[PDB]
Backbone:
């Protein structure tokens, strides 16, 4: 970076020189009228070149050499080390007339060299390197560069980013470090100051603190901060926090600048002499698919649903997971832990923590927080395992959300949430068709499970055709009078049997139609996830149709299951009993067990004595993040 | 693309098959209970494979072969040609019990194959190719692909895109072609229709017409159109227009879909069976730098400014350009042609036209159209020649706009215009510092000129130091009493001479300060344009300071000049006369003429008898577009 500094006719010029720049110096304007040639002297630590029409020659500290004065003959001035109190850094130019070798005038440049660098960890190893040449840019990929910021959604005691205040030093651990490194003499020369600043636009995206006492110096309603200069080699440590996630209209990128400003006069703005810039990207909110290792199983249910709690506890005891049990709240649905909460995470090189998206129906440390229809529930939000589709890899998987057909006039998840998920970018969301379901959640018809002992996975699909095939076989086998819902006393008077199901003509037509809805989804998943029929297992399911021609479960949907590695908690179907075993249970075992999946059926409905299509319990599994670092992905240009 | 179609127990299935897809067919669900094996037959133009657990074998039209019934044994069904009236395309599956070789039941699939493709010129040669496999994406660069749309800002008789109506067939020439190509029998089977559609979001970005009668079928308040199906090989020609340029919040990309919809029942939404998508990018508004060939010179001035008009006409007569003369209007400034109008262009493979940005102070065919401060004027908007900066090429140059320092609280061009220019992307704008000038326009201090006989160019910078050096030389030479403004009778009583200028102490300090403002710009231009001192010439300039400490010209700014290749119209400076020639004129000739630039001084101030810092005339040159195609650029990720 070349910077212009002119000698003044005939007055001396004093200037700060910032290392990493060099000066081009006009000596011609300061020459008195009539002068012919010029000579120069300079001090030890100042390098000077005479540049005549593009050709440069280094000049000695004390030479007698003379050059013709000319607009195209200039100086180039460089310094490789900062000034100290022992420095006298200068260049002095003498001017000569045609007649005689004694100088007729003199112009000089007194310099104070300083190092100024605003530094961040742009190489993404968690430590702040000195002046990374790439620090002003942000690039994706394994070779990518530039610093990362976490949204500080934490709380120690709204969330931590809600204000401009910092209390716990623990908070600073969530924060990215930014260091202003300087070197120079005891003070800046008269008329200079160093100022950190941000744009008005980024002022709601960031906050910056300086440390027993943490001062908030940039952020909401603070766009600049004058920095105190310390001489010698000094470092000022700053901590930077993100205030919000990428979204519609916010890419995730923010910038912080430091400038050396020169005081000109009263009422004149100060001149930026030198500016250094660092860029941060705020880390996206990321979702964890069923293939990732489980950590904690969160469950909600009424206090007296005893079988559910015993059977969930038993399942979890087969694993290394912890069980967290939560009951119902006045402001939350019976399923709220599944529907109102989604466990994601954020990651930076230095730190990461799980982060919960919380969407209450009505209404900690390193667990972060944050017209409507049923499709806005997080039962309607899933994510696939890592996939490759037509050569394009999605190392974090793809987010799936249920919707309706474009021209249908049907329900759709709110634009605000869809925009949020799309803006995270690294999960490249796909819309499925959930609006044929009364509740409208993708988790009603589909799930993913890992295949034990491999790196592969399966898509599990609800299938009505599988159920009808099975029931027709059992009927052919002489089991037509086999009764469903055994043990649910509130269903007993209905006397529902395989015969009674198979003879219901309108129910058959309804379920053929629902199977078309399932198959439409099957095709989208196969296309957008790069799946073949070998990656899919069909689980028998059955639905009843409402007045809107939407489906609700006839018996509990087995596809919505707790996946803990090889161990699966599967909703107990209460299917027809053949030889004192549920034919639905036996059929599901026959599909899954050969692959090394272990099935545990979990009864969440007995406590209610009947099943009308609604489940009153919910579960959500919190998982370890992907090993793959999000910043190593190269998302498509948006 | 694999699509799911199940045989129905035991009822026949009729389906449309779209070429470019294949069907996976479940034969197991339709089998009666107890059946053991199955056999199949199929017609000549239907290819059938039995796929047993991933392994596929082609099956003959009439074989006797039997396979074990099984959920994992399915059919794969493909067709390579559309159906005609002579077609009977079918697959028939027979089912067998354990005992006996006579079929116990049968299920069948009756098919009608059709070709459906929505086609655009994605390869950017101006003709619409058949089903470009890249047509659903848009990529930058010489190897880039996907179709281009023009904003139809034209008018033949607001602009043409302002409504949904089309009159002149000439209009359709501005429009991009989109063709729906189909092939099939006389009619679609019962229960199907073909529908073109767009998102609500894109409905204000596009419009689509179908042709003596042009019907507007998609656009504002029209999101879908049912297409009439014609049998045999048919093509429906559509014309597509852009309604607006890329902007803040609009990337420039729009999508159009066609779907085959299947009617299910009353109150049920129709099922999209097949969807094809094309994407367009709306061409950006591009600015033309002074290096590009001039076409027309537009000029405005009062009717009686005779010298100006004679001298401009004389200049233009040295070239092949046409002169267009415009006078003053009540709603427009004296400079309006320079300040309120900017001539850009747009280009698509098929067509391009110049497009004017019009910003009236108060208030045709293939010339398109479209708190505030002085910085919003287009005197404050320039563009550099093509440059390369640190290896990064800007083949269309970079847009330059004047601003103030970030922390100054000074003036800045309105966010809406800045956002617009940034969104065009291909000119990668740079902000300079213009706010030290009373009027605040970059064109007051800087310009570009080509170097005749080469591919190179020069930056011209106003310089106060150059003026002081020259005046001090002339004074030393005994010319101190040389008078400026000779012939301007309204300046005569001031008796301004070189001596009087040089002895004004406060004026010297003001101009040293203005030279610091110029040099700050010089450094930004050198940095952001990749320029060295060899690419720059300094023109003498002088300013007076106002109460806000901002500059206005002391004598006419020569840097704002008409550039027609080697020929330059330069504002006549009215500088001090030495030997009956203007010393400013002679000095400027001595700089430019050796490079083969021809200088003509143009007097725009004599008609006013004095110069107070304001010029009452304006010029704007309309130029040929770059040879380089904008879509061949690869802009940085935004
Ligand atoms: Ca580092
Ligand atoms: Ca925190
Ligand atoms: Ca806080
Ligand atoms: Ca924390
Ligand atoms: Ca969920
Ligand atoms: Ca083409
Ligand atoms: Ca038009
Ligand atoms: Ca129109
Ligand atoms: Ca036209
Ligand atoms: Ca302009």
Residues:
């Amino acid at each position: 970076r070349e910077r212009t500094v002119r000698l003044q006719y005939g007055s001396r010029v004093e200037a700060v020189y910032v290392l990493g720049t060099y000066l081009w110096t006009d000596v011609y304007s300061a020459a008195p009228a009539g002068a012919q040639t010029f000579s120069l002297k300079h001090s030890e630590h100042v390098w000077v070149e005479v540049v005549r029409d593009g050709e440069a020659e280094e000049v000695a500290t004390n030479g007698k050499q003379r050059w013709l004065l000319s607009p195209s003959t200039t100086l180039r001035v460089t310094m490789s080390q900062a000034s100290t109190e022992a420095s006298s850094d200068k260049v002095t130019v003498n001017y000569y007339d045609e007649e005689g070798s004694i100088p007729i005038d003199q112009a000089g440049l007194f310099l104070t060299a300083i190092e100024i660098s605003l530094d961040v960890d742009a190489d993404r190893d968690g430590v702040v390197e000195k002046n990374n040449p790439k620090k002003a840019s942000w690039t994706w990929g394994p070779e990518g560069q530039g610093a990362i910021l976490l949204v500080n959604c934490d709380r120690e005691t709204k969330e931590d980013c809600r204000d401009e205040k910092v209390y716990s030093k623990e908070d600073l651990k969530d924060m990215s470090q930014m260091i202003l490194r300087t070197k120079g003499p005891d003070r800046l020369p008269a008329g200079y100051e160093i100022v950190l600043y941000i744009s008005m636009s980024d002022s709601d995206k960031v906050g910056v603190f300086y440390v027993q006492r943490y001062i908030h110096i940039l952020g909401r309603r603070k766009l600049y901060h004058v920095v105190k200069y310390t001489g010698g080699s000094a470092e000022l440590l700053f901590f930077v926090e993100g205030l919000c996630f990428p979204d519609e209209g916010f890419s995730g990128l923010v910038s912080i600048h430091v400038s050396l400003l020169e005081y000109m006069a009263q009422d004149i703005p100060l001149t930026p002499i030198f500016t250094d810039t660092v860029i941060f990207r705020i880390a996206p909110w990321i979702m964890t698919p069923n293939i990732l290792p489980p950590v904690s199983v969160f469950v909600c249910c009424m206090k007296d649903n005893y079988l559910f709690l015993k059977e969930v506890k038993n399942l979890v005891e087969k694993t290394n997971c912890e069980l967290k049990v939560c009951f119902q709240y006045l402001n939350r649905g019976d399923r709220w832990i599944q529907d109102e909460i989604e466990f994601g995470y954020i990651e930076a090189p230095h730190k990461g923590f799980p982060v919960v998206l919380d969407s209450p129906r009505d209404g900690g440390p390193d667990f972060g927080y944050v017209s409507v229809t049923s499709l806005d529930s997080f039962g309607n939000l899933e994510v696939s395992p890592p996939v490759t589709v037509n050569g394009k890899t999605y190392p974090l998987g793809r987010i799936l959300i249920g919707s309706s057909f474009p021209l249908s006039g049907g329900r759709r998840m709110t634009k605000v949430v869809r925009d949020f998920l799309k803006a995270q970018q690294v999960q490249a969301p796909v819309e499925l068709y959930s609006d044929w379901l009364t509740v409208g959640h993708v988790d009603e018809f589909m799930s993913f499970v890992p295949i034990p002992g491999t790196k592969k996975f399966l898509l599990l699909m609800a299938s009505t055709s599988a159920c009808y095939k099975l029931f027709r076989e059992k009927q052919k086998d002489g089991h037509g009078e086999a009764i469903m819902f055994k043990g649910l006393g509130g269903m007993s008077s209905k006397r529902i049997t395989i015969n009674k199901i198979l003879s219901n003509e309108s129910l058959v037509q309804e379920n053929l139609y629902f199977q078309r809805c399932l198959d439409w989804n099957r095709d989208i998943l196969k296309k957008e996830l790069g799946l073949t029929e070998q990656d899919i297992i069909d689980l028998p399911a059955l639905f009843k149709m409402d007045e809107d021609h939407r489906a609700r479960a006839f018996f509990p949907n087995m596809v919505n299951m707790i996946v803990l590695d090889k161990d699966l908690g599967i909703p107990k179907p209460f299917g027809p009993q053949v030889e004192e075993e549920c034919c639905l249970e036996m059929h599901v075992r026959g599909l899954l067990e050969p692959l090394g999946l272990e099935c545990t059926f979990i009864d969440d409905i007995s406590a209610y004595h009947k099943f009308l299509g609604e489940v009153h319990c919910g579960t959500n599994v919190r998982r370890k993040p992907f090993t793959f670092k999000w910043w190593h992905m190269v998302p498509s240009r948006r």
